[PDB]
Amino acid sequence: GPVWRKHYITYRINNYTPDMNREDVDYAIRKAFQVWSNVTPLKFSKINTGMADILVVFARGAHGDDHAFDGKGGILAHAFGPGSGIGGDAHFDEDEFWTTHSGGTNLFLTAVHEIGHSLGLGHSSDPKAVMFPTYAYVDINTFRLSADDIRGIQSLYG
Numbered sequence: 001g002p003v004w005r006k007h008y009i010t011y012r013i014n015n016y017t018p019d020m021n022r023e024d025v026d027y028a029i030r031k032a033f034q035v036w037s038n039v040t041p042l043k044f045s046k047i048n049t050g051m052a053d054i055l056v057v058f059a060r061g062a063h064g065d066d067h068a069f070d071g072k073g074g075i076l077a078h079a080f081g082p083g084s085g086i087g088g089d090a091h092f093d094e095d096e097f098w099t100t101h102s103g104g105t106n107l108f109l110t111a112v113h114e115i116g117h118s119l120g121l122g123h124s125s126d127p128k129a130v131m132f133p134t135y136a137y138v139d140i141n142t143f144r145l146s147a148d149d150i151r152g153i154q155s156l157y158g
């Protein structure tokens, strides 16, 4: 499967969910990228305006890419694997209620999962792994990437 053929990868937050304050969204996404940068040689750089590899979008229902979202619950988000254009981009279902902690869908955790997909990872069968198909919550201070996630991502980048 595809991998980015560079280690310096940019992202841009196309739009901001009204569920959270902007600073919280920025922080959530930043920390999510940091998860993966902590165990690879990849470096991620935030762009406010202009060209970026990984676009982050909040949208609902059908939103232009042939993979419609399905309203509150069910599918929370999705992301395309490495490549130009839509490649890498990560979309979040706005019909979820995105949150800094629990009491909705935790953005940080979901973003960790999607960025995993953005980087070219598939799913784990290990429920401890962030790349497991279904969402779970833990506090960010308690969160750890599983050995399977680390094995996965290091198999692609190192």
Ligand SMILES: CCN1/C(=C/C/C=C\C=C2/N(CCCCC(=O)NCCCOCCOCCOCCCNC(=O)[C@H](CCC(=O)O)NC(=O)[C@H](CCC(=O)O)NC(=O)[C@H](Cc3cc(-c4ccc(-c5cccc(Cl)c5)cc4)no3)CP(=O)(O)c3ccc(Br)cc3)c3ccc4c(S(=O)(=O)O)cc(S(=O)(=O)O)cc4c3C2(C)C)C(C)(C)c2c1ccc1c(S(=O)(=O)O)cc(S(=O)(=O)O)cc21
Pocket: 072, 073, 074, 075, 076, 077, 078, 079, 105, 109, 110, 111, 113, 114, 117, 127, 128, 129, 130, 131, 132, 133, 134, 135, 136, 137, 138, 143
């Ligand atoms: C039999 C079976 N079935 C059924 C049943 C039913 C039953 C019952 C009912 C009831 N009850 C009784 C009791 C119960 C209790 C409770 O509550 N419980 C619950 C319920 C049960 O159910 C069962 C089921 O199973 C279980 C399991 O589950 C789990 C959960 C899950 N999750 C999920 O899903 C999420 C969502 C959430 C929300 O909501 O929000 N999601 C997710 O996750 C997703 C999924 C996907 C898939 O698919 O896989 N995912 C996603 O999105 C992705 C993204 C992401 C990821 C993430 C993450 C991950 C991970 C993580 C982690 C890891 C590790 C660690 C940590 Cl810390 C973390 C993180 C994160 N993020 O993000 C996506 P992606 O991958 O990117 C993608 C995309 C795209 C593509 Br192409 C690719 C890829 C009862 C009782 C009681 C009651 C009451 S009272 O008052 O009495 O209390 C009341 C009531 S009411 O409502 O009336 O008021 C009620 C009640 C009750 C009841 C009734 C509820 C049913 C459901 C019926 C069914 C069945 C079967 C089948 C079926 C069908 S079919 O077709 O299949 O056949 C269908 C149907 S329908 O309806 O839909 O049509 C149905 C059914």
Ligand SMILES: [Br-]
Pocket: 067, 078, 079, 080
């Ligand atoms: Br997709």
Ligand SMILES: [Ca+2]
Pocket: 069, 070, 071, 072, 073, 074, 075, 076, 077, 093, 095, 096
């Ligand atoms: Ca949904």
Ligand SMILES: [Ca+2]
Pocket: 052, 053, 054, 055, 083, 084, 085, 086, 087, 088, 089
């Ligand atoms: Ca892209």
Ligand SMILES: [Ca+2]
Pocket: 017, 019, 093, 094, 095, 096, 097, 098
């Ligand atoms: Ca929302």
Ligand SMILES: [Zn+2]
Pocket: 063, 065, 067, 078, 091
């Ligand atoms: Zn989409």
Ligand SMILES: [Zn+2]
Pocket: 113, 117, 123, 131, 132, 133
């Ligand atoms: Zn997934």
